[PDB]
Symmetry: C2
Subunit: 214 residues, 2 copies
Amino acid sequence: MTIDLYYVPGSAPCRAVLLTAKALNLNLNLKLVDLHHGEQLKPEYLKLNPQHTVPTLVDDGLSIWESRAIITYLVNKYAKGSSLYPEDPKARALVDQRLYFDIGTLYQRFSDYFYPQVFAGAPADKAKNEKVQEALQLLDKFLEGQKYVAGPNLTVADLSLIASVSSLEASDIDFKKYANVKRWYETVKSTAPGYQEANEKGLEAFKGLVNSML
Amino acid sequence: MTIDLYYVPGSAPCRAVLLTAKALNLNLNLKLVDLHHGEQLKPEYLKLNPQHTVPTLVDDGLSIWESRAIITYLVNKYAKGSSLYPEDPKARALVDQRLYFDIGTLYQRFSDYFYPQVFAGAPADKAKNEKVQEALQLLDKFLEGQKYVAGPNLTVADLSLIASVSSLEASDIDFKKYANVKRWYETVKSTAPGYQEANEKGLEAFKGLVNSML
């Protein structure tokens, strides 16, 4: 009957799913994983997810762990036809495009820039910084004349992207200097159901982990 | 009436789309882009794709450039209900999961390992090599007891992943040492319509670029 979500609150991809669940008003069985002490590396977790990451969604026989597949799965399953993931091909392709931009470009660049500094005491690399700036410039363009990032309505693309973009507040990347990004950030904060609990709470935990490590 | 695809044949994400088009028996208007001399950086191309990448699909008012959004778009548009991208949520989520694995893990790791060597004369990094091995080990697990990577039928996930995995033949990563990967590779080669033209031809061009640069 019930569906399990293995997660930690600090993790942006996890927050993408928490946001999507709030937007659909779902009741997932949240299962905190002790990443800090390698619970994800034990056989019982590998059974569910051999890539030993979070989040991992477990829906009876189905285990899936890419946040961006989970959020579209939740809509496809529970709210087929929702404006959060519209069925119109052109409209859907734009959402999908933004999701791939998120994983392959924005969050990847941020990850490349930031996590060496946090977990390997690396210095801040100017070139990697610039790659993040360019990702934000692209986002700022996507948002020119647009309320949301993939069409006129809030979509799973906004929720995934905001979970990523918000994580930048733990670093020295001033993303609010991009006017359209700043506008969109505020809009999504005030329109995504349960944002405080689904994203802001976890974001705070992430800032906590970051401070501790730095 | 007609739909444009800006591409170069050597590019794995481009080959993912060429494969998907062959599998759907579509007639795209192929438009070769002169990446080698920076045609993608000129204003006319930026207009279509500010991220200045290939492929870029242009369908009247719609421009989209993430290969993995394009291939699902082609199915959603022209063959809704196709086994190449099944509508069943669980079945679709598995395909989507594999697509995100492809961009965020397998191809990302390969890119990280290989392109510094090809375009920046970097030495081969053992650690980055190992990250690619681990991506292949994950693929090999996904394929345990399975003909295809995301269910019983050929899907856009196989086509995107094979475009990536095949690119490894230009490097020193022996992916065929993974028995399930080797089996799947062969199956897809012999079952994806137009594989020779959509993937192998371009793969050859890529090997050409690689040799030239090395």
